[PDB]
């Protein structure tokens, strides 16, 4: 669907790259703080949810804590992927990896959501992520990124979906 | 694949 991004993206300059990395790190700590801190989780639900009231009854902190345990894990794997393979996060298109975590981190996104939306999103994440091993690179994948040279190859590599 | 199976 997003061939738009895949039609004008350029390379990521040193600073734009770090910008992405710090963002992943900030979320990773946030996620850890939700399931590790009880005050933290309740405090975030009161300020992000449009209706904190109904969320604790319909969904409960117990289910939220679950995804966050799994969110912290995934943010960790991606972070290592990034470390072990410099060129992972080559262009601006890769900023799309962030879209996996934003729905549980951004205040605007979660405030606009509804109860039902949140419930199924949490259920969905809980089912796909565990058995989805995202960000776990293979030698073949590593080798590839190791060789990347231009946005041209990359763009076709991804254009090839 | 695994990534775009979620965007």
Resolution reading in Å: 2.3
CA distance A88 to A77: 13
* Structure-solving method: X-ray
| CB atoms inside a 10 Å sphere around CB A55 | 22
| CB atoms inside a 10 Å sphere around CB A15 | 8
Q: Do A96 and B6 touch (CB under 8 A)?
A: no
Q: Do A96 and B7 touch (CB under 8 A)?
A: yes
CATH number of the structural domain spanning residue A24 = 1.20.120.1140
C-beta separation of A16 from A96 below 8 A: no
If one counts the domains in chain A, the total is 1
By residue range, what is the domain housing residue A107?
A: 1-161
Q: Do A128 and B6 touch (CB under 8 A)?
A: yes
List all residues 6 or more positions away from A117 whose beta carbon is below 8 Å from its beta carbon. none
For residue A111, CA distances in Å to A52, A115, A127, A144 come to 10, 10, 23, 40
What's the gap in Å between the CA of B3 and the closest CA on chain A?
Answer: 7
List all residues 6 or more positions away from A118 whose beta carbon is below 8 Å from its beta carbon. A55, A59, A110
List all residues 6 or more positions away from A21 whose beta carbon is below 8 Å from its beta carbon. A79, A82, A89
């Amino acid at each position: 669907k997003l061939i738009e991004s895949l039609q004008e993206n350029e390379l990521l300059n040193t600073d734009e790259k770090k910008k992405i990395i710090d963002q992943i790190k900030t979320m990773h700590d946030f996620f850890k703080q939700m399931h590790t801190n009880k005050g933290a989780l309740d405090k975030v639900l009161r300020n992000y949810m449009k209706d904190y009231r109904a969320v604790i009854k319909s969904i409960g902190v117990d289910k939220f804590k679950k995804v966050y345990r799994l969110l912290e894990s995934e943010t960790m794997e991606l972070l290592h992927a990034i470390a072990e393979n410099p060129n992972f996060l080559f262009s601006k298109f890769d900023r799309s990896i962030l879209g996996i975590f934003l729905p549980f981190f951004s205040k605007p996104i979660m405030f606009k959501m509804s109860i039902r939306e949140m419930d199924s999103q949490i259920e969905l994440y809980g089912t796909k992520l565990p058995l989805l091993k995202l960000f776990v690179m293979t030698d073949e994948e590593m080798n590839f990124y190791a060789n990347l040279k231009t946005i041209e190859q990359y763009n076709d590599y991804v254009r090839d979906l | 694949x695994x990534x775009x199976x979620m965007x």
